[PDB]
């Protein structure tokens, strides 16, 4: 029963908190929490590889790709391990995130603890954008907020 947490802070007003829970080893992982300060609509939501925050979110590096695969939506087989799709922020900018992903894990080869949770500016196209940047980052835009994922329990 491993519990993690991440506090997304950034230069702008976007900030929030996202906890992770895993009951089993190499099983499903719950990802729940709340972001605020975003614009209304779809924002990118990824787990980038490096847990660096020296030069800001640009220090986070690319999406967590251990298997060396192309970019896609979370429900697709061809996707980065760190690809969690998009989040929605309502008229208040309050993105209530609740997700269950069995691709990520708090342990093993797909461990995301110590990696950088990153929310983006625009939406991810889930790898169907029809160009080269959709097959890498997913044209989600810039990196509004980012935080190091650490153990909560």
């Amino acid at each position: 029963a491993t519990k993690a947490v991440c506090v997304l802070k950034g230069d702008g007003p976007v900030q929030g908190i996202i906890n992770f829970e895993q009951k089993e080893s190499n099983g499903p992982v719950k990802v729940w929490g709340s972001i605020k300060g975003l614009t209304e609509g779809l924002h990118g939501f990824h787990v980038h590889e490096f847990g660096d925050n020296t030069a800001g979110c640009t220090s986070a590096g690319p999406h967590f790709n251990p298997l060396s695969r192309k970019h896609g939506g979370p429900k697709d087989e061809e996707r980065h391990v760190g690809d969690l799709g998009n989040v929605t922020a309502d008229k208040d900018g309050v993105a209530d995130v609740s997700i269950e992903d069995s691709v990520i894990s708090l342990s093993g080869d797909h461990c995301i603890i110590g990696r950088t949770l990153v929310v983006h500016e625009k939406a991810d196209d889930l790898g169907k954008g029809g160009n080269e940047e959709s097959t890498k980052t997913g044209n989600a835009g810039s990196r509004l907020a980012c935080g190091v994922i650490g153990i909560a329990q």
Partner: nanobody
Framework: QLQESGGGLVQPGGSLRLSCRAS????????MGWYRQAPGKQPELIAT?????????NYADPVKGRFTISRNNADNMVFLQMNNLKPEDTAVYYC?????????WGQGTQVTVSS
């Protein structure tokens, strides 16, 4: 839910302006997309519009530099302006949300390119 219009017959080298009205619940997602559909293939995602304010637009490779996407928030409407049309663009165009599950498809608009 979706309401497409504005296409038709156009000689090679013309232009068109496709409009789609999308309901408030679909437009509040602020991640719209114009897809093209050739008989036999998949409705590939041509152009996307997402982001705050007037939103930022992205375009595929075959239309990079010819098409332009925009949106009216007060109207909940998406616009696509296609310039320098080629016969490869003859397709049925639809407008639907991207980044999340696709809403039920509208009627679309036919866009034919011949002289």
């Amino acid at each position: 839910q979706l309401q497409e219009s504005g296409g038709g017959l156009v000689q090679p080298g013309g232009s068109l302006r496709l409009s789609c009205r999308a309901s408030e619940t679909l437009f509040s997602l602020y991640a719209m997309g114009w897809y093209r559909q050739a008989p036999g293939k998949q409705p590939e995602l041509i152009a996307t519009i997402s982001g705050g304010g007037e939103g930022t637009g992205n375009y595929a490779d075959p239309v990079k530099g010819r098409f332009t996407i925009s949106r009216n928030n007060a109207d909940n409407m998406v616009f696509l302006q296609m310039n320098n049309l080629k016969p490869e663009d003859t397709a049925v165009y639809y407008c639907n949300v991207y980044g999340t599950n696709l809403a039920p498809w509208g009627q679309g608009t036919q866009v034919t390119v011949s002289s």
